[PDB]
Amino acid sequence: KSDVKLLGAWPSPFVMRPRIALNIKSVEYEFLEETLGSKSQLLLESNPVHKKIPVLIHGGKPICESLVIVEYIDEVWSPGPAILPSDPYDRALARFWAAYLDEKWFPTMRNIAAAKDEEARKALIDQVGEGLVLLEDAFSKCSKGKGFFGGDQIGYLDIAFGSFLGWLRAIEKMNGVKLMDETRTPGLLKWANSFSSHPAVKDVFPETEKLVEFAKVLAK
Known part of the structure; x- marks a missing residue:
């Protein structure tokens, strides 16, 4: 230990x-x-x-x-179990999307709280939504009908994207918006439940309310 x-x-x-x-x-x-x-x-x-x-x-x-x-x-x-995909192309795609999430999508989503005017807020929220459309399509191609971006087993891209799910939900709740719905991200809704209930995830996964309340705490 x-x-x-x-x-x-x-x-x-x-x-x-x-x-x-x-x-x-x-x-x-x-x-x-x-x-x-x-x-x-x-x-x-x-x-x-x-x-x-x-x-x-x-x-x-x-x-x-x-x-x-x-x-x-x-x-x-x-x-132990493989976390990255074994195929070089699949590995490259997993790395590509994780970089997109960390460089573009998540900074955009956490900028929503500090938007000055209404139309800037809308523009950021629209960009988070377009990212989710992109990731819905990536999930279809990566998962090949299986449960995870990694296929049958949880993988690197599940970890990268799934780690943000609680903060997405908290930002959804605090802005009264629904960015994963069922029309736009059907696969991702299902994947969200597979990810948050996975035995390697569930005991380190945040309760949405906890995040919301914590954001309120940080507001300083």
């Missing part, structure tokens, strides 16, 4: 990602929570560049950046 430590603020979609990956591999680890109002000295020592979490410490060495940590876990604990 001491050989693997995960530094992280909580709740956080980015911190969720290595927790799910460690769960898939059944790797025991200690979760070292950052707490509001300070940055721990271990955080400052382990991630001097970004000073953020997650940080995985393994063999006395820190590994930063959520997705990079996920790949590291997949590669190091290779006898």
